[PDB]
Amino acid sequence: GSHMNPPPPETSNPNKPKRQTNQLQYLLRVVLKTLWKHQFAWPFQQPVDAVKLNLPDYYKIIKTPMDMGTIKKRLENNYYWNAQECIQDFNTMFTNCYIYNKPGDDIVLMAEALEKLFLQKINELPTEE
Ligand SMILES: Brc1ccnc2ncccc12
Ligand SMILES: Brc1ccnc2ncccc12
């Protein structure tokens, strides 16, 4: 892509520790599956392309970018060590949107809908076994 967009977040790194857990399996099979097909998911399914969107300040304001495409790849490629790392990525994604954008903007309403669903699903994150 454009040299003015940063590299996406890491999704493969032999140096980083990782494992499967039943919680991470739930995060893929239930949480990301349910969010991905939400009617408002599409803006969040890939990194923000600040060039195409004419947001030249985006990556000056958002220094820890995250999106559900990256999360999906991290889950499918078994990048994570624990559920907390993945939950953190979701929460970064939502809060980036709320930091960059005005309350009540469409993109914020979209994020808020996804976040509502996310919290309902994480309340049922299974006991680690
Ligand atoms: Br598309 C998109 C996704 C996430 N955040 C965004 N913020 C502003 C404009 C477009 C955005
Ligand atoms: Br793509 C895009 C660009 C700017 N604003 C947006 N708001 C909502 C959803 C997608 C957006």
Curated annotation (Swiss-Prot):
Disulfide bonds: none annotated. Ubiquitously expressed. The record marks N101 as: Acetylated histone binding. It is found in: Nucleus; Chromosome. Chromatin reader protein that recognizes and binds acetylated histones and plays a key role in transmission of epigenetic memory across cell divisions and transcription regulation. Remains associated with acetylated chromatin throughout the entire cell cycle and provides epigenetic memory for postmitotic G1 gene transcription by preserving acetylated chromatin status and maintaining high-order chromatin structure. During interphase, plays a key role in regulating the transcription of signal-inducible genes by associating with the P-TEFb complex and recruiting it to promoters. The NET domain mediates interaction with a number of chromatin proteins involved in transcription regulation (NSD3, JMJD6, CHD4, GLTSCR1 and ATAD5). The C-terminal (CTD) region mediates interaction and recruitment of CDK9 and CCNT1 subunits of the P-TEFb complex. It is also required for maintenance of higher-order chromatin structure. Interacts with p53/TP53; the interaction is direct. Interacts (via CTD region) with CDK9 and CCNT1, acting as an associated component of P-TEFb complex. Interacts with RELA (when acetylated at 'Lys-310'). Interacts (via NET domain) with NSD3, CHD4, BICRA and ATAD5. The interaction with BICRA bridges BRD4 to the GBAF complex. Interacts (via NET domain) with JMJD6 (via JmjC and N-terminal domains); the interaction is stronger in presence of ssRNA and recruits JMJD6 on distal enhancers. Interacts with NSD3. Interacts with NIPBL. (Microbial infection) Interacts with bovine papillomavirus type 1 regulatory protein E2. This interactions may serve for the tethering of viral genomes to host mitotic chromosomes allowing successful partitioning of the viral genome during cell division. It is linked to Cornelia de Lange syndrome 6: A form of Cornelia de Lange syndrome, a clinically heterogeneous developmental disorder associated with malformations affecting multiple systems. It is characterized by facial dysmorphisms, abnormal hands and feet, growth delay, cognitive retardation, hirsutism, gastroesophageal dysfunction and cardiac, ophthalmologic and genitourinary anomalies. CDLS6 inheritance is autosomal dominant. This is Bromodomain-containing protein 4. The gene is BRD4.
